[PDB]
Write a protein that binds this ligand. Structure first.
Ligand SMILES: [Cl-]
Ligand SMILES: [Cl-]
Ligand SMILES: [Cl-]
Ligand SMILES: [Cl-]
Ligand SMILES: [Cl-]
Ligand SMILES: [Cl-]
Ligand SMILES: [Cl-]
Ligand SMILES: [Cl-]
Ligand SMILES: [Cl-]
Ligand SMILES: [Cl-]
Lengths: 273, 273
């Protein structure tokens, strides 16, 4: 038996067996079935609040005309849900509220204080102290990592058994590029030959164009001119004069992929030279 | 003019113009053309050493019968190249030596001490203090991150505009699962409905099988039995009784992907419950 006590503010189970059984039966239902089974019991659990919280976040993203308006709405939203729920302290672009619960499926029966009862025993369910405790791990290593536009002068894409990079530096107006590629073997990562592919869009820039039809290498103006680099097969450590600076600042973006790293998985970087 | 002095141990350029020109012309050549142009000058540069270092690492991976033998070979290799070159201090599976040079294309002309000359001026080229200084960045954010088998009880795949996760925890033998999914909007990440896909291979495990043909939910033995989970469309925060422990330890692996995150980009995790 499931009993709603303390004027619809507490779920009480007969014993451990009743609780574990109700958890299995309720967690196996569809969201609508769960919402209706809880409506049957006239009990608002943390799960019903999560439905509401998620519904309200989706509506805030739809009514907000601009960032400043969203910021006003979202501050009120966080204040509203930021006590029962927890927000992402690592990535501030992740807007969603989170359960504080370690034993996640208990969300169906815990109340607004994270409580439920087994007979005369009160269970204050196990919670995370902070969001960082939930995502905490001893590892630094990942299967895959691809750089975004917040990476400065360094673009990479490390996949499961192939890596590619484009590293930029500048000495007296001369821009140096390092094209890199590795393959995962039985003993680890080692350099291997590949074809490099880049998409360069830079301001105040001259490209060090390679020899073509017996003309060049020559500095070709690419000031705000997007262009592509599709090399021939080369080693895993290629060093090149990438170009020169025409102005005080050389800004823009770079994208890098290879024969082994597909365009979809290309690495990005903002250029500041 | 390019002049090899101090009995083939130093490259001397006439002026800055000669150096910048030779750097452009040499960096635009093919690897073989560069190796031959340097052989023409009877000068061994850091570039020729990198060719040798890379060639020797590839040969060590081919002659090593096992890890312990490689370890003996690779210790001697590191000692040999670990002064002129730099090894990866962050990822120990990355075996390759690295240039200490900031201005990478200078590898063609720098000697074994990272030197070259402009007339009577000696240039001790700019180097990185440590490997960490080369990979150093202020950002924590990436475009893409996928967990590997070193991630314990948490598998994820965060792509450019879609995320998926499978988080496991255990309370008194009852295993709790959290299936998560987010989409990137104009204001950031928010929850959205998707179809989840998992590949589970666990020891000492009973799966909490959902209702099928009016039978269950029921605990089905999956002790060392690989099996798949292909859900129907569900929200971005699904909580489930995943199963139960049959023994003292529940170990194995989990793989997670979704309708938005393709199988290729599926996240991994080792399970220890
Ligand atoms: Cl009452
Ligand atoms: Cl990006
Ligand atoms: Cl400069
Ligand atoms: Cl090209
Ligand atoms: Cl390849
Ligand atoms: Cl001499
Ligand atoms: Cl992996
Ligand atoms: Cl346990
Ligand atoms: Cl299934
Ligand atoms: Cl989708």
């Amino acid at each position: 038996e499931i009993e709603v006590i303390n004027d619809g503010t507490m779920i009480k189970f007969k014993d451990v067996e009743s609780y574990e059984n109700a958890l299995l039966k309720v967690s196996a239902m569809s969201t609508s079935e769960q919402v209706s089974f809880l409506n049957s019991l006239s009990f608002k659990s943390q799960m019903i609040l999560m439905q509401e919280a998620d519904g309200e976040l989706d509506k805030i993203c739809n009514q907000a005309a601009d960032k400043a308006e969203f910021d006003v709405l979202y501050e009120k939203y966080k204040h509203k849900y930021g006590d029962v729920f927890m927000f992402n302290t690592i990535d501030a672009t992740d807007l969603s509220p989170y359960s504080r619960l370690v034993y996640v499926a208990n969300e169906y029966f815990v109340n607004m204080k994270g409580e439920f009862m087994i007979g005369d025993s009160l269970v204050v369910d196990k919670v995370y102290t902070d969001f960082k405790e939930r995502q905490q791990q001893f590892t630094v290593s990942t299967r895959s990592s691809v750089s975004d536009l917040s990476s400065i002068n360094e673009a990479y894409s490390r996949q499961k058994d192939r890596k590619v990079g484009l590293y930029l530096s500048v000495s007296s107006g001369i821009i140096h590029a390092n094209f890199t590629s590795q393959k995962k073997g039985v003993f680890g990562w080692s350099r291997y030959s590949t074809t490099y592919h880049a998409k360069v869009n830079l301001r105040g820039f001259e490209f060090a164009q390679g020899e073509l039809l017996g003309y060049g290498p020559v500095y070709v103006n690419k000031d705000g001119i997007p262009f592509a680099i599709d090399t021939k097969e080369m080693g895993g450590n290629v060093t090149k004069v990438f170009g020169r600076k025409l102005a005080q600042e050389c800004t823009g973006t770079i994208e890098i992929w290879s024969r082994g790293v597909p365009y979809d998985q290309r690495g990005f970087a903002t250029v500041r030279l």
